[PDB]
């Protein structure tokens, strides 16, 4: 039971050394393609690369590099791709994997402008009637709606494939109040939020990964891949006693390095997967009561 396990780690008061066990235990594959001279200016950190084996590539020919991976999680039968927040050339590379890899959903959980410093390039339009043209990948970007919540907003876009003037609907989900290197308000406004995303079709398996992203892709992002996962495989078999969170977490690693940034994510991590327990396990109305507390009007 994660639920005791939380207690008994929460009574001796050890978050950091439960989170540096992880760490050490957690998987090393290598990191060549992201660390070629001619992909230097792809990267936004020096530390956070895609291992080779999981690494999302581009189907062009110049080069296929983006600071990608695809987390494919087997016994709960779904997938993501997490990656890092665009920088100013790369852009075209993130829509374009957006295009080829399916994608229905974009989960963008930092800001543009973090602690005074640009995190991520303004990769989407704000206006509708200023839509976005990507000359290297040949795709063309426009808002099409936007639903702007206290602590979130849900975008819609209009992405067109020029070569083929194919057009998909994208749906962007920006959650704009976790701090870098923090967490959530509350479990309730995180859960309210990855149940948006869900009750959207963006997660189902008719469509390719969601793509999440903060600014490296690892600590944010890990944190709303690693509740995801757990509930889904709670839904499974509705046996909330069969998850091992550390283990999912583990696994996961085993596609992208340093999921889950801080001990006090991992913490926050479990707090999430309990109380949305309460819904799996048949309280619908615990999900109304999220919306409540989480005060997403205005």
Partial sequence: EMEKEFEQIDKSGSWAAIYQDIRHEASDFPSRVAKLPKNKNRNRYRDVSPFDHSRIKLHQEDNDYINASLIKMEEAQRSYILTQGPLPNTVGHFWEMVWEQKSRGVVMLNRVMEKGSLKCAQYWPQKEEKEM????????????????????????????????????????????????????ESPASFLNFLFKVRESGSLSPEHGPVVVHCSAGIGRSGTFCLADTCLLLMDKRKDPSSVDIKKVLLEMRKFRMGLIQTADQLRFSYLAVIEGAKFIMGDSSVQDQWKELSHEDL
């Avoid at 919540?149 to 998909?168: A, D, F, G, I």
């Fill in 133 to 184: 043209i990507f000359e290297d990948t040949n795709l063309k970007l426009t808002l099409i709606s936007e639903d702007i919540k206290s602590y979130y907003t849900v975008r819609q876009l209009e992405l067109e494939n020029l070569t083929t003037q194919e057009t998909r609907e994208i749906l962007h989900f920006h959650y704009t109040t976790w701090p870098d290197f923090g967490v959530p």
